[PDB]
Write a protein that binds this ligand. Structure first.
Ligand SMILES: *[C@@H]1O[C@H](CO)[C@@H](O[C@@H]2O[C@H](CO)[C@@H](O[C@@H]3O[C@H](CO)[C@@H](O)[C@H](O)[C@@H]3O)[C@H](O)[C@H]2NC(C)=O)[C@H](O)[C@H]1NC(C)=O
Ligand SMILES: *[C@@H]1O[C@H](CO)[C@@H](O[C@@H]2O[C@H](CO)[C@@H](O)[C@H](O)[C@H]2NC(C)=O)[C@H](O)[C@H]1NC(C)=O
Ligand SMILES: *[C@@H]1O[C@H](CO)[C@@H](O[C@@H]2O[C@H](CO)[C@@H](O)[C@H](O)[C@H]2NC(C)=O)[C@H](O)[C@H]1NC(C)=O
Ligand SMILES: *[C@@H]1O[C@H](CO)[C@@H](O[C@@H]2O[C@H](CO)[C@@H](O)[C@H](O)[C@H]2NC(C)=O)[C@H](O)[C@H]1NC(C)=O
Ligand SMILES: *[C@@H]1O[C@H](CO)[C@@H](O[C@@H]2O[C@H](CO)[C@@H](O)[C@H](O)[C@H]2NC(C)=O)[C@H](O)[C@H]1NC(C)=O
Ligand SMILES: *[C@@H]1O[C@H](CO)[C@@H](O[C@@H]2O[C@H](CO)[C@@H](O)[C@H](O)[C@H]2NC(C)=O)[C@H](O)[C@H]1NC(C)=O
Ligand SMILES: *[C@@H]1O[C@H](CO)[C@@H](O[C@@H]2O[C@H](CO)[C@@H](O)[C@H](O)[C@H]2NC(C)=O)[C@H](O)[C@H]1NC(C)=O
Ligand SMILES: *[C@@H]1O[C@H](CO)[C@@H](O)[C@H](O)[C@H]1NC(C)=O
Ligand SMILES: *[C@@H]1O[C@H](CO)[C@@H](O)[C@H](O)[C@H]1NC(C)=O
Ligand SMILES: *[C@@H]1O[C@H](CO)[C@@H](O)[C@H](O)[C@H]1NC(C)=O
Ligand SMILES: *[C@@H]1O[C@H](CO)[C@@H](O)[C@H](O)[C@H]1NC(C)=O
Ligand SMILES: *[C@@H]1O[C@H](CO)[C@@H](O)[C@H](O)[C@H]1NC(C)=O
Lengths: 351, 261, 351
């Protein structure tokens, strides 16, 4: 009957054509819309410029006079936004990040643009979305749509797969060392997938690391300081885009005793006619629980004097005048005496 | 120009340089790789020639951009070499331990894993056998290149025995019976205090972590309270997850795996 | 009415002729006017001298006596005005200057001369016009008019091309020094137009600059003092009417360590019959973060004493009477042992 009120509540949908980069307006009415000023064949209006108002007369054969005109504006921008995966590599196993990046400037204001995200059974309203505590090795899909003036015109689906993580953990059966420099470490391989078994060994001060193959389970460490405590941490590590190390199994052992090194700072001084004072510093490597110094005095490759003291301070007396004696001082930790240090010294004479 | 080369693990990847030899191959970081035919920085396994470069046994440390320059330096060839890891492999479990019962006064032969020599250890942490040579003669046992023979089995010969090959890839596990410190997993609520009990009251306690830095040392990145017997964690955060091993000078230690809820 | 009243508000237009350098005056009237003495056919009067008062009589058949008396002041010559480009060479990249000069003076006063300039959308009224904030590599168009007592009599126009300038900015890929004397610096050419590069290296004492071709991308500094820090500043420059160098890129690096040279004035003096005093000055080239001195005392081409002191001050006691001794003292930087300094001296004593 009357066209004034029939199309008052009409709906207009705007579509963006990339080949012409133009806007097409479509009326959500089954019946035909006919116009005389502009070409409005079927129910679509073409050749519309963004951010510009246009006047179109709307009439139908079923409804008689009076006629009416409608004013239309076109603010929707479709393709200058691209969906990007902003997932952090260090936490890519359980965190999924989705962001929108703009590549071409548009005249539309941001106050009338909204973003909607449907990720499986989750709904979000934000330009950039974050998901935390997601089960690894699950390939999910999520849709993101851009709405202008509460209408759907741009939508994009993206599929994201999580990465590997959390390997281990090795079970160290036992670590020990029955030799001065040789230690034996025995473990078992973890059930979960890993790559190459990073193992580190640390002494009191120094520390070192290395990697082992995924097959061997028994390892031997050489060139170890005798009577020195060592702590070993082994963790099965996998190589993703970021290397995932996993929990580490730790063990400790002390190496067996061994003969020490030479005594240090062998100082000999002359005080009287046949009295010499010999003192020295403890060796750098004790290699033993106890402390003891043995000094032997010889003449002509013949042992004639032998003394022992817990401290390196020995007095030599009752010797012939002007005689080249030999002093050999060595360290006896209790089990294996060290190699001696030998010096030659002459005496003084009788007034 | 700029190219991307992926390749696989343990692949001798060849990078082609610009003409007008000799050429120099550097990296963006500043590590010298190739100077003409002569090789520089041997710690990285690679070989050089007058024009090209070759990388041998590539891995994660090779994931970078290599720049090759000609003699005059007027041209550049940039190659972004990345490494894609192979799919993870599941390690096959070792053979399950088996039980053997030995009567008094009998000699028992136990078969080692294939591949001489066979190394035999016990549960208490001693080196029973290393090949033909036999250690700890007090236990009265013998060992050839393949088996281990217990002679005049004791009442104390009961225990676990482990046999390994030269490379240690395989293992056999026996439990011999004479017939007539587990790690603790602790879950801690974030922002709370956690108490860990160390060794006995006889001796100073030293603590270590997976990061290999002593927690009790000053200027530590995480708050802590160390005493001679116990360890206290105050306001536990997410970074506290890991493993902590505490041991004294008397060869006694305990491992606690701390996980934050 | 009378001719004086009818033609009281008559207007005159002046046209300049360069061939005769003369001004022709035309009355802005439609009807033909005749003059008594001077011929004034139609409405134009020719042969008028510049800056001279001209008296003319205007009358018509429709107006009676008195005749209109008109006084005309001829503007000066057009060719006497010259347009000059006052743009400075140092600021030619972002500034354009235009000026009007009067090389030949005229009897007309200079108080009633107006110069109106228009560049793009900017219109000003001044003898000299200067414009700033100009994008490089562009051509601009200006026009100007010269008016005699607010009456237009000269017009001109010009086009000015903006000179190229302000290149850069180059980005340095890396800088390093992996050798004792060789350092490698690699950069990237700038996007804007450029001709060559200038690289300046500064140390604790001297600063020296060098020029490089645009083709070169890498440079290898040689003949450098070991274990010294240099700061390198690189900037691309273009040879315009004046040289233009843009923002530079700065980096810093230090070389490696090399063995130090021999010590200086290793004085050796006698102290007693079995002791010697040894001193020396530190070497000029430390070439290391640590200072240490090592001395070796030998007798008969056989090492018998080894000492290490923080300073070159050594006492050689408990020697043998009447025998030679060789002292080899060198400076150690903690990374490489330098060339030892060797001297020989005889312990010329007798008990
Ligand atoms: C049963 O096995 C044990 C070894 O586990 C053997 O008997 C006893 O072994 C212990 C541990 O070595 C001996 O104690 C120590 O032995 C030596 C001197 O023999 C020395 O290191 C110490 O002074 C300490 O005594 C113990 O003496 C030894 N006892 C006997 C009677 O041999 C034993 O051989 C095995 N067989 C039987 C049938 O018991
Ligand atoms: C955006 O939404 C449209 C529908 O509005 C999707 O187009 C459909 O895509 C499916 C597969 O996902 C096809 O089977 C259908 O034939 C498509 N058309 C219709 C009318 O359903 C489109 O996939 C979505 N995503 C993108 C990136 O355009
Ligand atoms: C890549 O080439 C190298 C060099 O030939 C191979 O690695 C080893 O290199 C050493 C030192 O030159 C040689 O003595 C060895 O013979 C090489 N190993 C082998 C197994 O030949 C490396 O194997 C080559 N990689 C591939 C995949 O062929
Ligand atoms: C780079 O490798 C060359 C050998 O290819 C090394 O020896 C130089 O060789 C060039 C010719 O290739 C000679 O002109 C030089 O005299 C050689 N010695 C030098 C430069 O010290 C050279 O040492 C290597 N390193 C550098 C920095 O060039
Ligand atoms: C990774 O490949 C490198 C190629 O050089 C192997 O060699 C070691 O690389 C590290 C890291 O740069 C150096 O510190 C070592 O000196 C290199 N040599 C040795 C003998 O370790 C390295 O082993 C490889 N890593 C693996 C397979 O885990
Ligand atoms: C370095 O690589 C270049 C470029 O590939 C090699 O030059 C030619 O390489 C092609 C590759 O198909 C060969 O068929 C030609 O025989 C090569 N020509 C020559 C003259 O060698 C070049 O051989 C490689 N090696 C060196 C040392 O320059
Ligand atoms: C277990 O082995 C031991 C060691 O070889 C055997 O004892 C020896 O037996 C031989 C004869 O086979 C005698 O000649 C030796 O005198 C025995 N040695 C000792 C120290 O007594 C023992 O017989 C074996 N036991 C069994 C049950 O076969
Ligand atoms: C681990 O290292 C071994 C020994 O070099 C090698 O064979 C294997 O391929 C490595 N594994 C991975 C996943 O790279
Ligand atoms: C794992 O090991 C790598 C390689 O040594 C190291 O860089 C990294 O800090 C370790 N830890 C983690 C959590 O990745
Ligand atoms: C030297 O004397 C000590 C006691 O002072 C004694 O224990 C030692 O056996 C003697 N002999 C040697 C060679 O040390
Ligand atoms: C490396 O892989 C990437 C994946 O995007 C591919 O584009 C590139 O061509 C590959 N380079 C090769 C195979 O050399
Ligand atoms: C930059 O150019 C100016 C002239 O415009 C010149 O005086 C100056 O030395 C140049 N700076 C350099 C070469 O570092």
């Amino acid at each position: 009957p009357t066209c004034d009120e029939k199309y008052a509540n009409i709906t207009v949908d705007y579509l963006y054509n990339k080949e012409t980069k133009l806007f097409t307006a479509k009326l959500n009415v089954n019946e035909n819309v006919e116009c005389g000023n502009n070409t409005c064949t079927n129910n679509e209006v073409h050749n519309l410029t963004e951010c510009k108002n246009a006047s179109v007369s709307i009439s139908h054969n079923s409804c008689t006079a009076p006629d009416k005109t409608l004013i239309l504006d076109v603010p929707p921008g479709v393709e200058k936004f691209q969906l990007h995966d902003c997932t952090q590599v260090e936490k890519a196993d359980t965190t999924i990040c989705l962001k929108w990046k703009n590549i071409e400037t548009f005249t539309c204001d941001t106050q009338n643009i909204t973003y909607r995200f449907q990720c499986g059974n989750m709904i979000f309203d934000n330009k950039e979305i974050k998901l935390e505590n997601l089960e690894p090795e699950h390939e999910y899909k999520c849709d993101s749509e851009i709405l202008y003036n509460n209408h759907k015109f741009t939508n994009a689906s993206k599929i994201i797969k999580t990465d590997f993580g959390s390997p281990g953990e090795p079970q160290i059966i036992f670590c020990r060392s029955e030799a001065a420099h040789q230690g034996v470490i025995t473990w078992n391989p973890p059930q979960r997938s890993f790559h190459n078994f990073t193992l580190c060994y640390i002494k009191e001060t120094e520390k070192d690391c290395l990697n082992l193959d995924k097959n061997l389970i028994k390892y031997d460490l050489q060139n170890l300081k005798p009577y020195t405590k060592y702590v070993l941490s082994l963790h099965a590590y996998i190589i993703a885009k970021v290397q995932r190390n996993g929990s580490a199994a730790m063990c400790h052992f002390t190496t067996k005793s061994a003969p020490p090194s030479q005594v240090w700072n062998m100082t000999v001084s002359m005080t009287s006619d046949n009295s010499m004072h010999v003192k020295c510093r403890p060796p750098r490597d004790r290699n033993g629980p106890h402390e003891r110094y043995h000094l032997e005095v010889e003449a002509g490759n013949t042992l004639v004097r032998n003394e022992s003291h817990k401290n390196c301070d020995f007095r030599v007396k009752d010797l012939q005048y002007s005689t080249d004696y030999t002093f050999k001082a060595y360290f006896h930790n209790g089990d294996y005496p060290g190699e001696p240090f030998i010096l030659h010294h002459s005496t003084s004479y009788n007034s | 120009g700029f190219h991307t080369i992926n390749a696989t693990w343990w692949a001798n990847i060849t990078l082609v340089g610009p003409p007008d030899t000799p050429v120099t191959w550097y990296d963006t970081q500043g590590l010298w790789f190739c100077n003409g035919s002569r090789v520089k920085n041997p710690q990285i396994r690679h070989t050089c020639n007058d024009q090209n470069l070759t990388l041998i046994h590539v891995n994660k440390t090779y994931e970078r951009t290599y720049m090759g320059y000609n003699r005059q330096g007027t041209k550049k060839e940039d190659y972004k070499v990345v490494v894609i890891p192979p799919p993870p492999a599941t390690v096959k479990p070792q053979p399950e331990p088996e039980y053997v019962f030995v009567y008094m006064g009998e000699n028992k032969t136990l078969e080692g894993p294939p591949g001489t020599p066979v190394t035999w250890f016990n549960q208490d942490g001693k080196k029973f056998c290393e090949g033909e040579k036999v250690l700890h003669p007090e236990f009265n046992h013998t060992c050839d290149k393949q088996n281990l023979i217990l002679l005049f089995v004791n009442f104390t010969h009961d225990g676990a025995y482990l046999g390994y090959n030269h490379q240690g890839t395989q293992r056999t596990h026996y439990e011999v019976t004479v017939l007539d410190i587990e790690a603790m997993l602790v879950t801690v609520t974030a922002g709370s205090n956690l108490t860990l009990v160390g060794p006995k009251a006889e001796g100073k306690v030293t603590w270590f972590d997976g990061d290999l830095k002593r927690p009790c040392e000053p200027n530590y990145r995480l708050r802590h309270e160390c005493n001679n017997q116990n360890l206290t964690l105050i306001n536990v955060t997410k970074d506290y997850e890991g493993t902590y091993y505490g041991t004294n000078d008397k060869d006694e230690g305990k491992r606690y795996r701390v996980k934050v809820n």
